[PDB]
Design a protein around this ligand. Structure first.
Ligand SMILES: Nc1ncnc2c1ncn2[C@@H]1O[C@H](COP(=O)(O)OP(=O)(O)O)[C@@H](O)[C@H]1O
Ligand SMILES: Nc1ncnc2c1ncn2[C@@H]1O[C@H](COP(=O)(O)OP(=O)(O)O)[C@@H](O)[C@H]1O
Ligand SMILES: CC[N+](CC)(CC)CC
Ligand SMILES: NCCC[C@H](N)C(=O)O
Ligand SMILES: [Cl-]
Ligand SMILES: [Cl-]
Ligand SMILES: [Cl-]
Ligand SMILES: [Cl-]
Ligand SMILES: [K+]
Ligand SMILES: [K+]
Ligand SMILES: [K+]
Ligand SMILES: [K+]
Ligand SMILES: [K+]
Ligand SMILES: [K+]
Ligand SMILES: [K+]
Ligand SMILES: [K+]
Ligand SMILES: [Mn+2]
Ligand SMILES: [Mn+2]
Ligand SMILES: [Mn+2]
Lengths: 1058, 379
């Protein structure tokens, strides 16, 4: 059967703000679905609180709702758009959970909404761990010995049975959320408490250990005719015990005989059949004992996933698109295979002629007190992917594409370190993020493949390859540049060695190796992705580099080309925002008639979807890889301002190599990026900036400091020193020096300069004061407290800066307003993370406009010359990953730690903030008891916040000093003991659920370290808390609004724009 | 440095490394898309006189083992891969690939641009070639041998791989837990099937046995007469190498069996022989079908099955006599995959229901056979 006709309109549940374990893969999927269903003629309605997604672009769907993803809110959308059906398998766990809640709530029944893709029962079958387990035994599939628990007591008993260490896995969670490995009782209780609370169904599955077994995944697609295919198989590099998401993985599987692979392939199909996924894809995970091939089923995810994205990129088979279609009645045999020119059907199993490698990206450096060992709970914040003709080539390209500074197997320990083997050993035996490099160190240190195996459980098949690469490195080091003949170099290149890695080994510059390649005429060739191992031709240009004979690039001589450089893997601070920009640059220029070439290696993104551009090079974004592309494409221009820091840093070297960089110059970029260069410009501009000073020595610092005045913003990390004694203190632990603008409003300004004029894209006033990173601050567009007069001043300074710095395309300027004076914090001469939010809030596609400007079309020529001020408020709020690393003090500061964000649209500020707060998953309540514990400097404004809470119906508790201050003003909160004061104290009160809200502000290293328990408990016990007075006020205002009262679509919002 | 070189009829040269026996190899060059299963491939008699190229770069990851052999020897004329792994890593491995090739005296080459090779074959069709592995591979020589190759068109290879004398087979399928099971006692098998050995894969036998068949394997040229005398519950037409067309003996015998009511079932080659024997026409494909991901639609039921294919020739669908009904077609190219006699209990399938290697999707083809048999015995 073909498409469904008893369905016209479809609601798609988006995933929400990016968080660890639930990332960009969902925008890629959501967008695929939107696209697919749209092409089929369905009316598409979708909801996604995350503004930095292509799927929320108004032109991608019929009714776009950027609203909090809460069933009450979604009901309003339903009741409001009356969709015939709902597709809940394209939005991660958030979508599955929402779907089931809407279901639970009768909401679906209420409005006659048919669930497509997967049924509620199907979902539950796979999501309820108990149900899943029963299902496997029923199909004769083996599962680990285990037990279900709904309380601690139950938990403990299962443990008593399975023993330690044991695996804890909550029902209705993913990415390992709420789970872990308990090696002891202590760890056991903690993890258990954590998951029971997190589990949407207050249920856990506790299993015996299979740690060290091989880990495998299979991506399956099934149609209503019962047609079923394996789209891809994945073999994990890291063994069972380390979440797939935090593991190095490869495609296709490598160490299974055909016989074992069929058994697994058969099991995978059986599982979908038993679970009930009839129209869609699913991921099925397994454990295999390398010693005997014994197969164990671990889980199944009834939806698209992070693996399905990897899998789609790996094979060229667009899983989510296909799935959306299947959800509407189509069958596989009916759809055509995209990449094969539609020549073949979608009913086939891909075969690939290369090896795909994925490597997770971590950010442990941003979470000091965190446990940095890899486990079953994901901790990674992104991932890179690489394609190579061989595993070695594949692995190495991925290493250089990771954006961690590696050039491949850079050494971590010194050969002369007497303790080296001992350090290596620990790293191996207890994996952390750097395990991979340590594996190579182990080989340099004298450990054997068997020795490494024993500690890591990583299959020898991979280990021997790494070892062989080390040995190759030793030869390079030995023969030096002199030994780098053509044959040898070719050989090294074929194995994935980067010119940079070889340069370090031969003690020369990277450019020297490159040059040598040029001399030898040693350049890579390009192969295309085709889903079929070259069995059929392709009309698509999805390519990867390798060192081989035949090149499949066949670049055009026809079109003028524009290259867009991506940001590689996502990391904190370098999210999807930058990719949204790359995507818009591509869509716009292509629409404009240019031939668009994308350079990126993030498997989770829309930028790496072949549909997004004319040509896609799935390569590491490095000087070496880019120059090779350029070398053969010879583009008209290259865009380096859209991908974040990654391409930004290659700017100079690219130009230096004669690359045609468009938009703001590499020099210009540096003028803004170099503090000094920047200080002059400001100076020349007669602009205000905090007093500063580079201090070399300690004492030079204590004196300079006196000059600057306290407090101080010590940027070498980031810290705020309050006093002389603090200075030395820091120094002890520990250089630019800057007066910290205390009690200031932080403001961000996005703008475009075409050399003729400057367009203000948006003035966003932060809720949190200067001192809390902008990436972690909630913000409002338009400003909610800044005078027009002062904004006008900021507008003029932006212009002054724009023209002086020679900006051409996007720029972002950051200020601090203190005492009616504008101060400059910084200029980011490129696309900033606020660009999507502003575009959404204002209806103007800034990245599309700035990209045209960069390409040559003025703002005047485009008809985009006036700043837009929406008739409603747009509030952006963020989501922080502290819940993933409970050992970290969950407080805000000068360094960014957030992973994502949501947007709230309201008639008023209070209304927008409320929707933003809710969208961010705040557990804020409208009643209860609030705990106030503020710093000296806040003691004064607290009174008012306290009055506000009072008028709302809250009761109040407070600590000593704060109570003292309230009493004096006429407010008598109930006194609470500080942990050291006695009992009960706040921790007890928090642990015992007494509060529904906490406001705790602090100041000073010592005071912070001391108050750490408040924040930590608050987060643990799920109590809403603010760590800024400014945030408290805002929260207070929203108390007056109702986020579920009214909803608006993006199209409506943009229509209201006059 | 142990050089190896492969040269195609067209002059195209691939310089790589020797991973098997020293010497030369001439044959039809084919490409195979199977990501797993290289041993079963190599041991497939249907590969006789063909140089096999695997599209999946790493070949040998799991080593080799005796249960993964589809016949008594290595049938491939030669092997062309992109990369031979440093080690074999599988609990089932008994010997690394290279060692295995050396032992079977197979000329093999590694380290060549297999994708280039594959694209050439696809675009320009199958080509004959020569691989020379030794000290100074002479390219002009290779080119010579390749060119001098006769070709597989009109070449009957079935006669060359067929068993000398008849024999009995009563062994079933391997299991993870039990491995290759002990052969069954004749009394244990309900039916008796007589099987024409046109270069039959062991798994066909194994799987028929699994279904209650006691078998008697016969040379390709065995006479119908001699066959009818055995009182077979069914007749099975095996898979095999070369052109099916030049096999007059078989076609003749097959025709003899069709005048009867005995159930007949052929696989791949046996499928074409049946088709011919029924008056159909066979062709040699541009490059053929070799891989384990090939979509095949059962037109009666309208379902798709992922299959294992190994064929260089096909049965023309436009020439089908009215007594032959079309039961399956390839989804990749619409080519003919199955046929059933409208008047006789005879049918066949172009792919490999026995996989080995490959998806088990088509296994049920056998079932129909059984059914036919059971019902032939009811009489
Ligand atoms: N019995 C077990 N022993 C050891 N590790 C396990 C076991 N079960 C699961 N794991 C590990 O935990 C990870 C997460 O479990 P999974 O069931 O996939 O949870 P989630 O749905 O959160 O991804 C697996 O990828 C695997 O590495
Ligand atoms: N002089 C200062 N006074 C107050 N806050 C400041 C000052 N300098 C920096 N900050 C704070 O630190 C954050 C990060 O500083 P910034 O120079 O923008 O670094 P980054 O390159 O990480 O964006 C700002 O967003 C702001 O809250
Ligand atoms: C991972 C996404 N959440 C659960 C589905 C946790 C933040 C959204 C509430
Ligand atoms: N916009 C940052 C998140 C706010 C968090 N509740 C805090 O106040 O620490
Ligand atoms: Cl979750
Ligand atoms: Cl076991
Ligand atoms: Cl932690
Ligand atoms: Cl080659
Ligand atoms: K309906
Ligand atoms: K699950
Ligand atoms: K079990
Ligand atoms: K793993
Ligand atoms: K997974
Ligand atoms: K701020
Ligand atoms: K910056
Ligand atoms: K070569
Ligand atoms: Mn899961
Ligand atoms: Mn999982
Ligand atoms: Mn900044």
């Amino acid at each position: 059967m073909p498409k469904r006709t008893d369905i016209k309109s479809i609601l798609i549940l988006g995933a929400g703000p990016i968080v660890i374990g639930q990332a960009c893969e969902f925008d890629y999927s959501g967008a695929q679905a939107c696209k697919a269903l749209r092409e089929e003629g369905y009316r598409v309605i979708l909801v996604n609180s995350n503004p930095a997604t292509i799927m929320t672009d108004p032109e991608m769907a019929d009714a776009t709702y950027i609203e909090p993803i809460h069933w009450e809110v979604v009901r309003k959308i339903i009741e409001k758009e009356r969709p015939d059906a709902v597709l809940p398998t394209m939005g991660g766990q958030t979508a599955l959970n929402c779907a089931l809640e809407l279901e639970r709530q009768g909401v679906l029944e209420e409005f006659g909404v048919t669930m497509i893709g997967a049924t509620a029962d199907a979902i539950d079958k796979a999501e309820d761990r108990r149900r899943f387990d029963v299902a496997m035994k029923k199909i004769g599939l083996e599962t680990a010995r285990s037990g279900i628990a709904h309380t601690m007591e139950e938990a403990l008993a299962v443990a008593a049975d399975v023993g330690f260490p044991c695996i804890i896995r909550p029902s209705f969670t993913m990415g390992g959320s709420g789970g872990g490995i308990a090696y002891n009782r202590e760890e056991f209780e903690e993890i258990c408490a954590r998951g029971l609370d997190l589990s949407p169904t207050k249920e856990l599955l506790i299993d015996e250990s299979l740690i060290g077994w091989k880990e495998y995944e299979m991506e399956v697609v099934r149609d209503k005719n019962d047609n079923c295919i394996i789209v891809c198989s994945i073999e994990n590099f890291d063994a069972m015990g380390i979440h797939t998401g935090d593991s190095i993985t490869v495609a296709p599987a490598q160490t299974l005989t055909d016989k074992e692979y069929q058994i697994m392939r058969n099991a995978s199909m059986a599982v979908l059949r038993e679970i009930g996924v009839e129209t869609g894809g699913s991921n099925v995970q397994f454990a295999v004992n390398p010693k005997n091939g014994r197969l164990i089923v671990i889980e199944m995810n009834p939806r698209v996933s992070r693996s399905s994205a990897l899998a789609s990129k790996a094979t060229g088979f667009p899983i989510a698109k296909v799935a959306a279609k299947l959800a509407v009645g189509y069958t596989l045999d009916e759809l055509m295979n995209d990449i094969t020119g539609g020549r073949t059907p979608a009913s086939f199993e891909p075969s690939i002629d290369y090896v795909v490698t994925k490597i997770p990206r971590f950010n442990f450096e941003k979470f000091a007190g965190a446990n940095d060992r890899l486990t079953t709970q994901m901790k990674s914040v992104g991932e890179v992917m690489a394609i190579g003709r061989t595993q070695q080539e594949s692995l190495q390209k991925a290493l250089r594409g990771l954006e961690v500074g590696a050039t491949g197997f850079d050494p971590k320990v010194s050969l002369d370190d007497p303790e080296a083997l001992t350090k290596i050993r620990r790293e191996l035996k207890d994996a952390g993020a750097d395990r991979i490099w340590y594996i190579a160190d182990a080989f340099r240190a004298g450990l054997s493949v068997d020795g490494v195996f024993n500690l890591t459980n990583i299959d020898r098949w991979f280990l021997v390859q790494i070892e062989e690469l080390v040995r190759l490195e030793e030869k390079v080091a030995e023969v030096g540049i002199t030994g780098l003949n053509a044959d040898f170099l070719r050989q090294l290149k074929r194995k994935g060695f980067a010119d940079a890695r070889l340069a370090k080994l031969a003690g020369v510059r990277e450019a020297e190796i490159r040059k040598l390649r040029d001399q030898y005429d040693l350049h890579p060739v390009y192969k295309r992705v085709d889903t079929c191992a070259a069995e059929f031709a392709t009309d698509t240009a999805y390519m990867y580099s390798t060192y081989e004979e035949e090149c499949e690039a066949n670049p055009s001589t026809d079109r003028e080309k524009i290259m867009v450089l991506g940001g590689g893997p996502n990391r904190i601070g370098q999210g999807i925002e930058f990719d949204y920009c790359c995507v818009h640059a591509s869509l716009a220029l292509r629409e404009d008639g240019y031939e668009t070439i994308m350079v990126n290696c993030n498997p989770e993104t829309v930028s790496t979807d072949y549909d997004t551009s004319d040509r896609l090079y799935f390569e590491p974004v490095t000087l070496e890889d880019v120059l090779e592309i350029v070398r053969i494409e010879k583009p008209k221009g290259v865009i380096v301002q859209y991908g974040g820091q990654t391409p930004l840093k290659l700017a100079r070297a690219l130009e230096a190599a004669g690359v045609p960089v468009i938009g703001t110059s590499p020099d210009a970029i540096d003028r803004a990026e170099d503090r000094e260069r920047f200080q002059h410009a400001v100076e020349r501009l007669k602009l205000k900036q905090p007093a500063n000073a580079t201090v070399t020595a300690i004492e030079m610092a204590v004196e300079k400091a006196k000059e600057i005045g306290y407090p101080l913003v010590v940027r070498p990390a980031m810290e705020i020193v309050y006093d002389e004694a603090d200075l030395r203190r820091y120094f002890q632990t520990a250089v630019l020096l800057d007066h910290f603008l205390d009690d200031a409003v932080e403001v961000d300004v996005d703008a475009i300069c075409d050399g003729e004029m400057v367009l203000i894209g948006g003035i966003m006033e932060h809720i949190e004061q200067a001192g809390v990173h902008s990436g972690d601050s909630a913000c409002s567009l338009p400003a909610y407290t800044l005078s027009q007069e002062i904004q006008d001043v900021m507008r003029q300074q932006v212009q002054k800066l724009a023209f002086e710095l020679q900006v051409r395309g996007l720029m972002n300027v950051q200020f601090a307003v203190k005492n009616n004076e504008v101060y400059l914090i910084e200029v980011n001469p490129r696309a900033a993370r606020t660009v999507p939010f502003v575009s959404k809030a204002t209806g103007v596609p800034l990245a599309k406009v700035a990209a045209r400007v960069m390409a040559g079309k003025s703002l005047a020529e485009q008809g985009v010359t006036k700043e837009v001020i929406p008739p409603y408020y747009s509030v952006k709020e963020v989501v922080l990953p502290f819940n993933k690393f409970p050992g970290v003090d969950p407080l805000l500061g000068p360094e960014m730690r957030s992973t994502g964000e949501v947007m709230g649209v309201g008639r008023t500020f209070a209304e927008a903030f409320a929707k933003a707060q809710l969208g961010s998953n705040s557990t804020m309540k409208k009643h209860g008891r609030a705990l106030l514990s503020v710093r000296e400097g806040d003691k004064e404004r607290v009174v008012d916040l306290a009055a506000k809470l009072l008028k709302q119906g809250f009761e109040l508790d407070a600590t000593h000093g704060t109570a003292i201050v309230l009493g004096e003003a006429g407010i008598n909160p109930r006194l609470v003991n500080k942990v050291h004061e006695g009992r009960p104290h706040i921790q007890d009160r928090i642990k015992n659920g007494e509060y529904t809200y906490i406001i705790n502000t602090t100041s000073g290293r010592r005071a912070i370290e001391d108050s750490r328990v408040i924040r930590r408990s608050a987060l643990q016990y799920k109590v809403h808390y603010d760590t800024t007075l400014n945030g408290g006020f805002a929260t207070a205002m929203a108390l007056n609004a109702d986020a579920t009262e009214k909803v608006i679509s993006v199209q409506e919002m943009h229509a209201q724009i006059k | 440095i142990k050089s190896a070189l492969l040269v195609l009829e067209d002059g195209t040269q691939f310089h790589g490394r020797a991973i098997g026996a020293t010497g030369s190899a001439v044959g039809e060059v084919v490409f195979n898309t199977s990501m797993t299963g290289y041993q079963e491939i190599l041991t497939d008699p249907s590969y006789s006189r063909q140089i096999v190229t695997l599209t999946y770069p790493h070949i040998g990851n799991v080593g080799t083992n005796d249960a993964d052999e589809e016949s008594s020897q290595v049938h491939a004329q030669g092997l062309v891969i992109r990369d031979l792994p440093l080690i074999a890593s599988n609990f089932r491995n008994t010997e690394d690939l290279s060692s295995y090739l050396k032992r079977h005296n197979i000329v093999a080459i590694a380290d060549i641009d297999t994708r280039k090779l594959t694209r050439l074959l696809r675009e320009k069709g199958a080509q004959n070639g020569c691989i020379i592995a030794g000290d100074n591979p002479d390219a002009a020589l290779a080119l010579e041998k390749a060119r001098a190759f006769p070709g597989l068109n009109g070449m009957d290879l079935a006669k060359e791989v067929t068993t000398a004398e008849a024999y009995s087979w009563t062994q079933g399928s391997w299991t993870l837990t039990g491995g290759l099971p002990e052969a069954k006692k004749e009394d244990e098998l309900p039916f008796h099937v007589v099987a024409y050995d046109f270069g039959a894969k062991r798994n066909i036998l194994r799987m028929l046995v699994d279904r209650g068949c006691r078998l008697t394997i016969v040379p390709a040229q065995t006479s119908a007469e001699d066959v009818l005398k055995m009182n077979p519950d069914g007749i099975f037409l095996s898979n095999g190498p070369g052109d099916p067309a030049p096999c007059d003996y078989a076609i003749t015998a097959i025709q003899k069996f069709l005048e009867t009511d005995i159930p007949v079932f052929g696989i791949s080659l046996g499928h074409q022989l049946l088709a011919l024997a029924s008056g159909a026409k066979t062709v040699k494909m541009k490059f053929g079908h070799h891989g384990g991901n090939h979509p095949v639609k059962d037109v009666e039921k309208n379902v798709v099955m992922i299959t294992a294919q190994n064929h260089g020739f096909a049965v023309d669908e436009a020439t089908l006599p009215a007594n032959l009904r079309v039961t399956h077609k390839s989804l990749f190219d619409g080519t003919l995959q199955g046929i059933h006699r409208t008047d006789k209990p005879a049918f066949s399938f172009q792919g490999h229901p026995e996989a080995s290697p490959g998806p088990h999707d088509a296994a049920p083809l056998f079932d129909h056979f059984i059914e036919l048999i059971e019902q032939y015995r009811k009489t």
